[PDB]
Symmetry: D2
Subunit: 440 residues, 4 copies
């Protein structure tokens, strides 16, 4: 599953529909990023630029011009064909091929952007620009507007109104098309396969980074070359560090390992967390904490639907957590009083859910305290966890236990669809999977 030229075009048209007549929208590509000295990190296109183009080159700018309420057109600035640059660094789309390939009306060399952009903006009323997104982009836009402002003797005029298109575009991104959901479903499947593999490969004495290696290889083999975020493999006390990425320790017989990893497939993020015993068998203490986190996740998965909110579901999770922690003696007191005091916060200190899409922490307005009412087409994670610090003032057997279990879901008309349920999470199923693997 992928996103096609025609869908990128529909998105551009949907933006144009929202624009004022006599306006232009400017969407800039991500800069290349140095890793060390003359070597660069693998290129990652800006998500908003990607959303409107599917074009994976730097030094590119999409310009959507809405001349009036019926007439509009698109111009792409992009790198020119250049034999020498291409022999060295790779092929470039260039200007001749771009209109047909991408479905834009005109393409111009990026090297000419300062000579041409002001001409496209001249006489317009409004420019849509994400001010502050990139320095290089602000320089280009500010230079063009200055030429126009100062050019009255050449009959030039600048648009007086600049509107940030991020709020409009991020609201578009928040609601996925069926094609996007299909891509995210595949990302979920690929990510789940990787997590199953990690559980099947894990043995005491392996390093945390070995499981990262297994996961990344699995992503690759299905065509997801890069992860969507830096993979977390936190064994033992490291599982109590939320975004632990050092992954440098030897995994010990008797510890849990928490793996938070997700692929990037056609631009879209998977995001799964599983926690499991390094030796294939939960201890009693580990199981007691795990059961609370799993009940939190299972309850959330029953509840998420149009018309509820992340805030509302979080309330149910907090009750499950406080109730369970009281039963184990980790918290002491009356459940309702403890809930009123947010007594769970030392052990569950992050949010239950975030939006998911072209970014792992995806764009879109949450509302105050994540109170926004859910609607079909929203995609979000569900990620309860409990983290009992090595020095917590709790019964000793629970110290140093970090557990998170996370699935990705899409809100549907009828509830939600779980995109990541193909990797096991019930403790007996985890144990069975690992027992079967350990016998090979």
């Amino acid at each position: 599953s992928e996103i096609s030229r025609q869908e990128f075009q529909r998105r551009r048209q949907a933006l144009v529909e929202q624009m004022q007549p006599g306006s232009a929208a400017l969407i800039f590509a991500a800069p290349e990023v140095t890793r060390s000295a003359d070597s660069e990190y693998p290129y990652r296109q800006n998500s908003d630029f990607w959303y409107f183009t599917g074009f994976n080159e730097p030094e590119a700018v999409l310009v959507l011009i809405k001349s009036d309420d019926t007439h509009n057109h698109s111009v792409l600035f992009n790198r020119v064909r250049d034999l020498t640059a291409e022999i060295w660094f790779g092929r470039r789309l260039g200007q001749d091929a771009a209109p047909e390939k991408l479905g834009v009306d005109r393409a111009l060399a990026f090297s000419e952007i300062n000579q041409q952009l002001y001409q496209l903006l001249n006489g317009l009323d409004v420019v849509y620009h994400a001010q502050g997104e990139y320095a290089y982009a602000d320089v280009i836009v500010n230079s063009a507007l200055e030429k126009l402002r100062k050019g009255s003797r050449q009959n030039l005029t600048a648009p007086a109104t600049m509107i940030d298109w991020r709020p409009v575009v991020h609201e578009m991104r928040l609601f996925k098309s069926p094609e996007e959901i299909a891509v995210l479903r595949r990302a979920g499947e690929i990510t789940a396969m990787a997590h199953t593999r990690a559980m099947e490969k894990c043995r005491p004495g392996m390093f945390e980074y070995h499981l990262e290696g297994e996961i990344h290889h699995e992503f690759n083999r299905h065509g997801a070359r890069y992860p969507s975020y830096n993979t977390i493999v936190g064994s033992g006390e490291n599982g109590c560090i939320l975004a632990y990425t050092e992954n440098e320790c030897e995994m010990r017989d008797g510890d849990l390992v928490l793996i938070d990893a997700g692929c990037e497939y056609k631009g879209y993020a998977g995001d799964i967390t599983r926690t499991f015993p390094v030796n294939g068998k939960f201890t009693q203490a580990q199981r007691e904490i795990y059961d609370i986190v799993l009940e939190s996740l299972e309850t959330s998965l029953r509840l998420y639907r149009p018309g509820t909110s992340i805030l509302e579901v979080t309330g149910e999770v907090v009750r499950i957590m406080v109730s369970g922690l009281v039963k184990l003696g980790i918290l002491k007191g009356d459940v309702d009083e403890l809930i009123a005091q947010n007594a769970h916060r030392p052990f569950f200190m992050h949010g239950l859910s975030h939006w998911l899409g072209l970014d792992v922490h995806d764009v879109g307005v949450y509302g105050q305290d994540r109170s926004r009412i859910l609607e079909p087409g929203m995609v979000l994670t569900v990620e309860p966890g409990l983290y009992i610090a090595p020095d917590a003032e709790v019964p000793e057997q629970y110290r140093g236990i970090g557990i998170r279990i996370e699935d990705d879901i899409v809100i549907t008309e009828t509830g939600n669809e779980n995109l990541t349920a193909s990797v096991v999470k019930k403790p007996e199923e985890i144990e069975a999977l690992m027992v079967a693997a350990r016998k090979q």
Copy 2:
């Protein structure tokens, strides 16, 4: 093999030995780098900062103060311990543990650098600073010097002399210690294992990126988590693009694949290229080009030694290439006349060798046209290639063939040591390796 605290300390002392009395050297850590939105790329420390510290955190500055010719000391600015930041993002060394861990005299919070740095520079004659390396660093240094310049009523004075330490430090880096050579030897071995694996796994119909996946998994399993540069897997006509990294094509029965890949092990780069038939058997045309490139590499490996130069060895390679291309009818004319006209350049358009170390294209002065005389302790690549474009005006059977073969060597008292000869390169050995793998 690794680099130890005591070696980092010896390096700092070696720099101090070269500094003027009444001076301070300032070495800044790399900034964290955004990948998309709120997600960052995996952190890569600045190579020069790494060289003097082995410390893998951002927001850190090493200050070496040479008060006079016998008295000197070191101060590290680094991130403070912070429970909340650490629960979220990972542990920090902090100030209490840093002096013993790193072997510096004093450690101070990075948050206090603007309140403290000018106090360390006050009254010194010289500051060593890599101006222009990082914007954030220039801001800090410039602010401190301005405070001092403008602070005469508070009895403050700025050092009037600013010296770029890059030339001195890069000359240090150019000559490897035995410990560095041991690390590079392991990087070479790990990289060679990965290339052997790629040859054993390659089959027609696999995608170029599949071999990248195999290579990266092999790096990981030996403790080299990241590649030293973006892996190149160029099959067919893609092998004629020097740093092709798209790796997006299906590998065809009858094509060659060129793989240029290297691990980063304890900061140090491996860098190997092998070219081999996707189907395990070179065609006659492919073998004819391969033989010329291999003779170029084998001759270079015989010749490299103290007292020669990259320029001198390149001359021998150019003769081998022109002679071979004339024999096949790719070039026409008198060999010596063709050499005088640099007639090889359409087919071999890059350098034979680059320095190798903490960067894949490592630091250090080459001399005009890479004429610097070689000395023991220098580490360099040897990477002849021939690239016959799909549209080259040559006998048709050679069009679209891109071949490079690259080894990493260290210059010794007695010649050179090849760090990467554990992955095969003779065509009969490549074929035998692949035949054996294809039968499994």
Copy 3:
């Protein structure tokens, strides 16, 4: 005559009337400007900031908040009272006195602008800001918007729309109130007195700068401390340099001197040019050129009125100039053909008229080729000139003659009022004035 608190308030209200509900307008003071080392030029407030405040301090920001269509208020950020800063550098208005003195609702310390501005902008739909006017202002505004954009977890939101208020404000400035016209009338009178003085003081052997001295002293004595632009005193060939300000030459018996000078009175510019003989008597050649320029000015003064344009009046002037130059043999050919070829341009190369107000080249849209139809309340200069270069291919007696004659006018319902006719311009009146002075 001056502009009062209540008028500044009416202007602020007039701007608020034009603003969208749920918006804030930000108007920043001019920075102080270094002359040399630690010495600054005399402070000149930004004209737009002045227009809305009459407040002559730096480090001040006026914020007009339009909460909805009936409710609005103003906040001033300005320097705090500070005994030491005030003993050294002068008194400051401060926060307690500002609301009553300036007629704003609230005043806050400038030192707190970064802690407070984002709070004022939070939740608004539109911010009016002159982007690119001042670097320091852009930094403040951009920082505030960034805090808001990134502050969703603190329930903060940024206005998505930024509108340049310059076009609206400059259209306000283009049409003067009766009070502004009264101030400009006084500026005209003061400037005219200075020009009369220069004519009465001029003698051969004085330096050009001596007349600048007389002019500036006259401005001062009437309470116009500073000129509105750098005074031009161009004698002989220097009169052919349009904005000659060196004023370094000894004025020669037999040369003309062109003086372009204007006061700044309560923020408003006078702008007069007179050209006259250094020795008090025009030569025949000088008179022949002078007569053409004077006829151009006199005709323009008859014609300027509501419903015509600078372009239209310029056409009449060009005909007068071409006709006169043909009669003297400076141009040769048919007048209408010469007009069609713009044959006057080597000798009259600037515009006839510019707007006049808080800036000498005042703000406001001219229309293409200065075609905008004139309306009552517009204030403009009328400044024909002829400049015959020392090396011009013309009859020799005209070479090196530079003449400009300039008056300031206000368009009225019934034509125009000349604000500067109290300094003579008829050649016989100039001669009589100088003869009378030279006899003393």
Copy 4:
């Protein structure tokens, strides 16, 4: 008196003598400065650039190249001849005339500085540059060094050492040549004439700014077009504000007026302060404070000589002040105890002396607490004052009195020469001068 081409050349040579072999010094002109909108302040050349050139244009850079210990040469970058720019804005020296006019070896267009500067710096060991002086200059220098650093394949190399030339140049400026002393002597005479005029013109009911007008006219008539700093005319309580420049009040019968004003003559500053009765007669209270300030000045003038210091002379002044204030009942207690407590500081809160030259607060190292031993050729002010605030807890008759009396001196072999004693300061002489003027 002026500074000639040959002296500017001697200065350049004196700098070259101090430079390391294989070095270049870069000295940049001041930028033009906006006053309002498209109008600029009158141009003021950077003092250090002026010191080495006597060239009064912006967009100019002096480059002194010391190739080795016997060979050196100079290159000027400056604006090209351009007919249109010159018809509008004034004549330019250009490249053809510059070598002879200024005495430099070569001149190049400023428009070519980025194409040429790196070529001049290539292969040098040291660059002398005043980092942070001007943004535009830092951009040019940093760009050139970056081209060189990154240009090894084009055989380019950057100087690794950057030295601030300000300390060396400011030490040069601190010691005046006989020609400089002659210029400063004339500046002193011109400034003194202006102060005499102000005393002769002052009458009750005039505004403070009227005396500024008289002073500036007097500067102008002697060829000092601009003041060296903004003129201070502080009458009554305004005399207690040290750099009061509003000069907006009506001068009252019975008040003192303090005038601090100085001309700029051929680049050099005069700096005189006189305080006198607006009505021509000191009251008893005014005379009692005046006598203490005058004794302080007269004693300082007797004492200043080679081998003493500003700190040492200040000690004598503090004793005179504390002794006098005790006698009047403004201070109470034992003189030596009061001195030990710095009890004078509420009334004399600034320094006695500053260096004087191309800047009014001239360059040069003072030493801790202005302790540097004085030597012949140093030029400094002597400016005791007493300022009794309107609300001071002192006998009522002294409240609101601000008195400063300031002369400019040059240290000679034999003591000092007073450059400003031609304007009276003894109270009986002030009264006689004013009485004589008031009778006219």
